[PDB]
């Protein structure tokens, strides 16, 4: 037991190194796509359905990112407590949570709570790839779009009952010592008008800014979901390292 926990601690240290490397590798593309999105938003009309809040919100998708392995000490517990807080806030605002899950631990938790999970993805929590994030973001965005024509409890012309909001509840890797579960509204996105300062030479948009913005917003959402998954993987590795250190101390 003691030897196993010590070995797991060292392996978790190596995994933390790998996860931090992955986050750093992902950073440049995120920065560049954010810059392009800012340019297109400055050039295009800010009226995308992903960018406009639905009136009378009545459903909110929530993606809870958890781990597959339970050797992490309180990582899943903190994530699920934050998810419960977000559910309470959504109910207070009058919205029904529509639950999506990443990882088996949250699946078991919500199965015990007997809360229906619309869709779940498992098996990649430790080393998530961009394809998993793209699939998750595509499902979430499709659900968000399906909610445009929904009223009350009727799916409308879609035939699919969507959601009016998208939130992500994952563990943010603040540092090696601190990893805090956070809730982030992935959609609808708000517009933060920063002071203009760049404007001396115009960008050329092919074919036109509106279609470029239309195509790039879903990609931005997928990129942010991928970043959240990477942060969750790093946080899970850190918390597993801490849990194994504590177990070795106990043993």
């Amino acid at each position: 037991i003691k030897k196993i926990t010590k070995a797991q601690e060292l392996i978790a240290t190596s995994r933390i190194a790998k996860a931090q490397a992955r986050v750093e590798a992902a950073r440049p593309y995120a920065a560049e796509i954010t810059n392009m999105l800012t340019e297109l938003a400055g050039a295009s009309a800010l009226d995308h359905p992903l960018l406009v809040e639905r009136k009378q919100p009545k459903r909110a998708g929530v993606l809870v990112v958890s781990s597959d392995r339970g050797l992490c000490g309180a990582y899943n517990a903190n994530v699920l407590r934050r998810a419960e807080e977000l559910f309470s806030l959504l109910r207070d605002e009058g919205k029904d949570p529509v639950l999506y899950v990443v990882g088996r631990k949250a699946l078991g938790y919500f199965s015990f709570r007997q809360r229906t999970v619309v869709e779940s993805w498992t098996g990649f929590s430790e080393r998530p790839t961009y394809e998993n994030a793209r699939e998750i973001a595509d499902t979430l965005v499709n659900a968000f779009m399906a909610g445009a024509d929904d009223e009350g409890d009727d799916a409308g012309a879609d035939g699919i009952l969507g959601v009016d909001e998208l939130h992500i509840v994952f563990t943010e890797f603040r540092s090696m010592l601190s990893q805090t579960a956070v809730a982030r509204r992935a959609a609808p996105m708000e517009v933060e008008y920063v002071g203009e300062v760049g404007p001396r030479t115009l960008y050329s948009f092919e074919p036109d800014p509106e279609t470029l913005f239309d195509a790039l917003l879903p990609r931005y959402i997928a990129t942010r979901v991928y970043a959240a998954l990477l942060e969750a993987a790093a946080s899970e590795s850190a918390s597993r390292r801490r849990a194994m250190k504590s177990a070795t101390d106990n043993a």
Binding site: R22, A25, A26, P28, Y29, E32, I33, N35, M36, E39, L40, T129, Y130, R134, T201, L202, Y203, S204, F205, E206, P207, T211, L212, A215, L216, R219, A222, T223, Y226
Partner: protein, 118 residues
Amino acid sequence: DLNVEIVAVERELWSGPATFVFTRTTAGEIGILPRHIPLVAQLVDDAMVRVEREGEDDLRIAVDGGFLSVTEETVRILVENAQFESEIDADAAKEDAASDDERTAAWGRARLRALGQI
């Protein structure tokens, strides 16, 4: 000379000087020389990027989910995925091309275009 940077979602793939950059945006085929005007475009689904350098064979990259950003100093291709010509496998590209899934067929066509089989 212009600085090309092919950057994938997961990692930065390639970076370096180049004399010419050819690709296929949604508007149409585009060629970029050093002092091209600032530009933002979306690459076609089966886009291929050719990077002609100085004293070296031009790179041929199959690109999946591409965007192009030309700036006064740098030309950047943001790709969901990309494969250099050497890394591509001809038989798999042929098989994937013209499959039921549109994205798989586009990826196969991009790999074939990079190989030169077009």
